[PDB]
Design a protein around this ligand. Structure first.
Ligand SMILES: C=C(C)[C@H]1CN[C@H](C(=O)O)[C@H]1CC(=O)O
Ligand SMILES: C=C(C)[C@H]1CN[C@H](C(=O)O)[C@H]1CC(=O)O
Lengths: 257, 257
């Protein structure tokens, strides 16, 4: 049996109605739950879903040099494969292997319906509408690292802002948009943005184009025998239409708006 | 010095005004010419551009089992790295290594302005407007392999059509759209589509959404020491904004419409 690490994040992995009545993998449903099933079928493995104990994706602490989250579990040999909306980034690729993207995306702007913002350039040129990102992930690092004037102006604002503009989770950020009467805008990945837009009470929307271009990859530890099988499986699922089918299913078929 | 294989395809690789006056790499300009420069800088190599002798991308002949085009050059050790709009596909990944995508795309519909087509579903339900793809590449194989009713109807039509609906090149297909008074539609990758839309005489446009989702990757031969350097370089260029800069430059800054 192969340990598959993942994280609670809608609609990728979620708890079924009364998971208690269910056992093991049957407790969870979602996009990555479906993805895991399909990949495991393709590569012919038995697998077990283990939610990353610390509820994190993967960063390396600057002082201690330890890797946390799902990346951590791979690096320290606690799991064999990570199947989650885990953004393909250089620092991560330096320590683990990513398959080709199973999903393509870019950073995007979530507003509450009615907010006079259509673009990053709209956000930067004002201070009346607060804006931020989820804390400690790839979006914040895009802004931290950016050398593009507009995003640099956005990073300086976000980093100095009191109260903090950074959220623990996507859901927190979404909650703050909905609850802030148009005074908070949220910078998150287009995939969660598009998802939320189709969720009651339908008071949110995506605005403007994406600030960048990247994808999510299935991750394994360096030297893993499961590397090539996993990668050829993503390409197979992609080409067979199965990835598109799964996005349509969890985003739009289950959509509420 | 490293042999870099590539192919003539606008705006990726093209001949400069009077390349004769120029020498070696200085003869060519374009997106992949720029890409090669940047990657070579990042990984610290000397390199030489060699246009793939057979003017092909990479397929394996069913009888002889030989690989042609740019993939071929890698497999048979004629070049060390392929930098071109080479679509990441399973069969190719089985024989060579692809870096992460430097460009994201999907199959798209090119029409002559005025053509009453907005979608694949519009194309399939009629026969008055002919439609086809470039021959012997990943787009045709998407249609050949597809199990989705609409695309299967499209493949059966395309394969049976007389005269042939398949073109030697992108440019041929583009020429046939422009020249056919709205009686031919062209199925090509969104990247070339978007490019052509910005090219005089501006009589073409992209219509509807993409039929699929994939990317272009820098390719190296299996076991190459240049694998990880190349891959970390694409991620670096991506994250530094350089890929976006290069697309904007060759598509839109040089745009004519
Ligand atoms: C949900 C979170 C915190 C994750 C998921 N993907 C990104 C990552 O892998 O870092 C993060 C999103 C972001 O940073 O906006
Ligand atoms: C220009 C051509 C013939 C190439 C380029 N990328 C695809 C490939 O790598 O196969 C092909 C496009 C296509 O098939 O529509």
């Amino acid at each position: 049996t192969v340990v598959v690490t993942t994280i609670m994040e809608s609609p990728y992995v979620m708890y079924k109605k009364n998971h208690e009545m269910f056992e093991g993998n049957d407790k969870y449903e979602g996009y990555c739950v479906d993805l895991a099933s399909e990949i495991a079928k393709h590569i012919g493995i038995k697998y077990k879903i283990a939610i990353v104990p610390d509820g994190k994706y993967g960063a390396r602490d600057a002082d201690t040099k330890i890797w946390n989250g799902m990346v951590g579990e791979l690096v320290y040999g606690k799991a064999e494969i990570a199947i989650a909306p885990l953004t393909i980034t250089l620092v991560r690729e330096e320590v683990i292997d990513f398959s080709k993207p199973f999903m393509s995306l870019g950073i995007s702007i979530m507003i509450k319906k009615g907010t006079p913002i259509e673009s990053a350039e709209d956000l930067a040129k004002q201070t009346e509408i607060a804006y931020g990102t989820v804390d400690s992930g790839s979006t914040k690092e895009f802004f931290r690292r950016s050398k593009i004037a507009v995003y640099e102006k956005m990073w300086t604002y976000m980093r100095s802002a009191e109260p903090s503009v950074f959220t623990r989770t996507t859901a927190e950020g979404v909650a703050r948009v909905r609850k802030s009467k148009g005074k908070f805008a949220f910078l998150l990945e287009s995939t969660m943005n598009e998802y939320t837009e189709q969720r009651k009470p339908c008071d949110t929307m995506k605005v403007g184009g994406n600030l960048d271009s990247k994808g999510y990859g299935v991750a394994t530890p360096k030297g893993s025998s499961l590397r090539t099988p996993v990668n050829l499986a993503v390409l197979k699922l992609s080409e067979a239409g199965v990835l598109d089918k799964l996005k349509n299913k969890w985003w739009y078929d289950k959509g509420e708006c």
